[PDB]
Design a protein around this nucleic acid. Structure first.
Lengths: 169, 96
RNA sequence: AUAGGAGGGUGCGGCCCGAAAGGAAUGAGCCUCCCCGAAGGAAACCGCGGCGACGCGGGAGUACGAGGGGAGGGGACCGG
RNA sequence: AGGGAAACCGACAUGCCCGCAGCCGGGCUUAUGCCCGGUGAGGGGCGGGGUGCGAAAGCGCCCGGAGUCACGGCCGCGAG
RNA sequence: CAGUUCGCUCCCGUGACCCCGGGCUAGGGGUGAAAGGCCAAUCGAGGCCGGAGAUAGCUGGUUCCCGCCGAAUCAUCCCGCAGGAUGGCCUCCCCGGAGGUAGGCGGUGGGGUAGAGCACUGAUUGGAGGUGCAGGGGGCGAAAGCCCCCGGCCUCCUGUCAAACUCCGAACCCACCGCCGCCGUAGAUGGGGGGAGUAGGGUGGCGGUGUAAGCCGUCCACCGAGAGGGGAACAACCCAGACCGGGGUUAAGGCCCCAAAGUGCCGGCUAAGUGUUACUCCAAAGGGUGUCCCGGGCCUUAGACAGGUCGAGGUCCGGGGCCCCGAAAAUGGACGGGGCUCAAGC
RNA sequence: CCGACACAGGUGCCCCUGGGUGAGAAGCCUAAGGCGUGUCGGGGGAAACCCGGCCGAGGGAACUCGGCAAACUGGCCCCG
RNA sequence: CACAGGUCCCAGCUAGCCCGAAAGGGUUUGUACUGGGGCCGACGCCUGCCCAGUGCCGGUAUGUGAAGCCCGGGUACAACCGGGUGAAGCACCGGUAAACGGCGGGGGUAACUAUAACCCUCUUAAGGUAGCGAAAUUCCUUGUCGGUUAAAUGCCGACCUGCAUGAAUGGCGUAACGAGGUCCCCGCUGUCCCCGGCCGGGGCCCGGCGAAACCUCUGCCUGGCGCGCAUGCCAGGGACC
RNA sequence: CUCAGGCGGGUCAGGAAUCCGCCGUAGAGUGCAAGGGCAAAAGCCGGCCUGACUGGACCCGUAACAGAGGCGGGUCCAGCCCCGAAAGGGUGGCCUAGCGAACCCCUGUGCCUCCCCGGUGGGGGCCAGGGAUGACAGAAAAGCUACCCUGGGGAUAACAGAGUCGUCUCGGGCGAGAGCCCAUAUCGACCCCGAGGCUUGCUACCUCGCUGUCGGCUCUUCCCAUCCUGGCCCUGCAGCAGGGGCCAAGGGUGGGGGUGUUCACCCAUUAAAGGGGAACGUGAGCUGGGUUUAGACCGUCGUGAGACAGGUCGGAUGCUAUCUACCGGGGGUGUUGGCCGCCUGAGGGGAAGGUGCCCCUAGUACGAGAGGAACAGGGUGCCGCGGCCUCUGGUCUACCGG
RNA sequence: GGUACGGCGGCCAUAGCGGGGGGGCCACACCCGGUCUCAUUUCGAACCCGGAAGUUAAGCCCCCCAGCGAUCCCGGUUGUACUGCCCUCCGAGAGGGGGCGGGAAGCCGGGGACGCCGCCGGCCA
């Protein structure tokens, strides 16, 4: 696994058309909804990036496992809904290099990543009042796994920002 | 890889019609007439394949200097050279 | 014989040479005084504004100013 | 005197239009000069003509006289 | 001493032994117990003179001064890729005689990039409803077929995409016309002729590619082919494009000393020598009751917090400015140097 | 004599050799014969260092790619 | 490399092989116990299979096969066209490997455990026999085991999994021989621990003869800029000749 | 005339044979890729035909602007025709690919021509079609060089420098967990952010009118990411020891076996037997074992010459120091007149010192036992440095003896 | 000049899809029958020929709507996203920012929209 700083930035054009990309790998993350999506919840904690960035599927899966384990241990399966809103479409390639360097250097697919704009939500955890601290801790744990600065916000059912109200209360 | 210019090279969007304009065009453009010295725009109609000039000249404004058969003789200034084209009136539009 | 840059460039100072071919006793460097003057251009002092550095009106487009002319003194250098 | 591979054939000493310089007439301007209208060499464009290809139309080349010789110079090609 | 010698050590030393005089074998030839060895200091084809001043797209050189104008390394073709040809760009001369268009305004047309979106094409999380739908799994029946789960296919909701998607769509660019502006009878636009050089470009912004450096194009601004004044020195960065002798004022930027110009002024911040860096050079994720501030909630001047008693503001959160930790390299030393703390830093 | 030389090479050591020791035309000394011209001299605890040579306590290859170099043995007689 | 020894090939003489433009010639004042042409290389024991390929030799019934000749057409004559005859050489057939070369590859077993070839299936011209083998041939490799040392990428012995050994481009062994490469033992020693003395010649000074290589001009440093490792540039440091 | 697909209904007949109805913007088809275009058609089904023809003109593209042989395409005039009632269309395929100079040759056609003239056979010329050059704007065409030679090239590789850090070395953020409970005594998954230039790679910026390679020996110096020595903190630290971390670069970090080796492995000691930079420090200091010429052998590959980042034996190391640099040794000037003697010490240099072991504390603290410290106090070895010749040893070309 | 009449057209969805009500002087249709003209790869179903027994059920004509599709205007998101020129403005980088000039797409709310226009003829007057 090469360092994520290589694929962190978004200066390259979008590379997603599976009809023309030869040898594109299959996704490594297959679960995007956990908990009880049907049940309603008063509050939702969303995680946003502070800058445009490509987040790898490995980082997405690691954050998913960590947050899901924490929420299962502390809150309970029927008391939360954890969702990842983004899907890895960008295909990350690498130059395949006896041996010729820089000759015919177009890369072959090696992984997948999700490209995100500025202030775009990555994941959401829907909980009630009594599990807000656990939701915030899970959001922080997820943010610790990503290659960019991230911040959390709290929204009510109507969609208004109430993070300051909730944290002060 | 260098690619030589052809008649239909890189004309995917230039020579494509609107979905609501598919089919035969109205006959006014087909039957329109011009006088010598009149200035006309070149708007190629993709459905009509007769008397079509090179798509490189699509969108340019020329002057009518004659008429041969059913096609009009249009003069354009490509750089400093004078270029003569035989364009069907369906591919032409009057200026103003 | 306490001083650093390819050995030169600009300006001048110290020492030295300076008959002819350059100027010059029909007057040299030098000293004093008077007139005009482009672009530019102060200050003393008075009045006022600003927390302050400071600025504004008068003085004043004055003193001065590249250069262009004139008069007096002295008597051998100036250019190189 | 050109056209054509060849046989071979064989053309405006100006019919017309536009028009610069020059010339002529008029108006303004102190003058220079500007404007309007004619005539306009050279210049441009038609019309007509010789020939080759064509059944023909039609196209290519050519047609209303400027060439030739010398001195000097630049350049291309071959010779070291 | 010597264009292969000297010393010590070593080997053969009656044999296929060593040496001398007279002869023969001559250059694609001789000779070779075969190393391409030897053939007069020369041998994978000797030497001398001649062809001959051979040829090269490769290396080097090319001699006085002033004046005017002043490039290019980009397209097509070549057994073409260190070389040529046709064009583009430069220069000199002439014909012709009234228009021309680098900039702008308005107008008549063209476009599908950025952005955005799911209406086609292809992707994409979960849920609800419909459809037995040729699927599978069980139970279930002699056999005709049922009952569920899952799967497939449609509609809706929910959460996401596209260089080789577009129901939309800029900035902007291009063609033409009228006008403003500028150039032109002291002759432009244009046409004819003579002579070239140029076929390695670089920096910078943008695009594709690459971990990056870099590679490949594009834009024509600067170096190339450019002085002077600055960035400490610098090709490219800033001012600025330059005949000669003088005077003055400004430009980049600078004013503690080096070093011309203020230890200049008002308000605030920093205590780390952080900094003293416009750019050619400059370290991050994660943290800090370190300080200076803004906004929003709860209690809230003997009703708050800390330890029913005191008796004045505490409690939390999200942010902004400077600074701190994170922070290890080899000759002795780099804010240009000295040094600088209500600064000579921000 | 040839090699550019009054060249430590090659041509020619091509032919010849008194005494002692000794197997010996070996090494060493010496007679005859020749030379002091294998041609710059003088000084010196006058060094370091280099070339050539002698010796080295205890250990005995631990050196090194490798006992390189050096060192041990050495002639003759008798057993084996 | 040569060598004595082994073996193969051509040749009965106006031969075989070779020089040359030819004339003539070398072998040759020679005659198969000879002349010429390859390969191996004393000596001892041996030298297995393959002629499909490429070479060489013999045959060549048959096909093709140039000129010349003959026949028909054509040309008032020719050029030209068609056919027949048709040598050598190829096609074809046979010998030849001490001629050039080659001598393979998958499954399962005999489970008195497991693992081996007796064994049955494609396959070629045939599938490497006797010997030797981690080799001057072994990539993995410093193979594994044993001996040598306190310690062994060495050396010797053995095993065989021979990447890619092998029988006259010879196989194996071998006394004597060797300034050939290689390992060990006794002895020896300044190779070393660890260097110290002494001698002669240079070096050094004095009197003489008297050059050459080389030389843009010059010539101190640290950190930097720079065509990317500066005596000469920038900022500093130091320095009498 | 209208397709693909779907729905509902039908004898065998079912998922799928043929048929009726409805929805159906093309979701079909159009010879073949893709793009574009096509619905009373350019698609499907039929009728009649050969315009896939002859003689010519102009224009666009390859090849913008801006030059072009050959080729492709478009707009037309005339002739002879085809379909249609007519309008109208037809110079191949709905548009964009499916292809080619000179010379020579073959064919069609109807003209000109061959040296004084005429006839015949034959030849030459003009127009049209065809045979191909795929390196496709058009040579006919296999290799080795390590015996190599020449002209050049930092326009271009290997060593070294430079840029970069994917890789390498070394850290950091979070904490699933493993640890009898306990994430942080210790290890720390999945992810994420870095530093160094000590491994390798990438680029081709300096250097091809030469900057001499690996390893070893000799010698000097520097960094800390510290192996030991000095001082500390946490512990799943009883003691003796261990594990993790902090300050600290004054000193030390050694001897041997195979191998050319660096490295790695092994042996006996030791407090420990650290990693690196200095042109992978150091060949005008050495050696020449490996690598990398010319000789030769083996194996494999090749018909062969020959080749192998495959082994193997042999295979040259030039110097009179010009400047500067360092080590020591001298002559001068200056230091406001000259000379002799004794002093001061601004600055520079040092490691002048470093480190083991033994006795005792003490069989004590600690500990169930086994085992087993420390402060203080004494002694001594080794490495390093500066001196000396009384003792011992070496030499002693003075000297004495055999 | 009137007509809930027709023919030929222009723009080619603000005009289409789907619904509700009304109408036939004339005219347009549905409809009746296949000898003749013409045709079925069968079928007078289409096309064609000859007509007016019946019907306004629908094609057609007139009025209306906003469920779908499309599209014009106004307000919010919003001068948001994006962008031309200059810069000694900040940022480690990514990128951002200041001045002057332009400026969306989508979504939400309220209106619009069930076409407009040209030539001629028929019938009545």
């Amino acid at each position: 696994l090469r360092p994520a700083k290589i694929d962190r930035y978004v200066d390259k054009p979008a590379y997603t058309r599976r009809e023309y990309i030869r040898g594109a790998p299959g996704p490594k993350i297959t679960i995007f909804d956990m908990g009880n999506p049907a049940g309603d919840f008063e509050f939702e904690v969303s995680l946003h990036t502070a800058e445009p960035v490509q987040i790898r599927q490995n980082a997405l899966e690691a954050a998913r496992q960590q947050v899901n384990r924490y929420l299962q241990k502390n809150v309970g399966r029927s008391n939360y809904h954890f969702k990842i809103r983004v899907y890895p479409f960008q295909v990350l390639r690498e130059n395949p290099m006896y041996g010729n360097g820089m000759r015919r250097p177009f890369g072959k697919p090696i992984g997948l990543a999700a490209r995100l704009k500025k202030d775009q939500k990555i994941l959401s955890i829907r909980v009630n009042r009594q599990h807000l601290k656990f939701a915030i801790e899970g959001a922080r744990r997820a943010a610790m796994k990503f290659p960019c600065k991230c911040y959390y916000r709290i929204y009510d059912k109507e969609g208004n920002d109430v993070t300051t109200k909730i944290l002060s209360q | 890889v260098q690619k030589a210019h052809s008649f239909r090279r890189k004309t995917r969007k230039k020579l494509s019609k609107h979905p609501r304009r598919r089919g035969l065009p109205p006959l006014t453009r087909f039957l329109q007439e011009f006088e010598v010295g009149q200035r006309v725009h070149i708007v190629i109609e993709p459905s009509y394949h007769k008397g079509m000039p090179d798509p490189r000249f699509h969108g340019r404004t020329g002057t009518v200097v004659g008429k041969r058969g059913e096609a009009y003789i249009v003069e354009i200034k490509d750089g400093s050279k004078v270029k003569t084209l035989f364009i069907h009136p369906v591919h032409l539009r009057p200026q103003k």
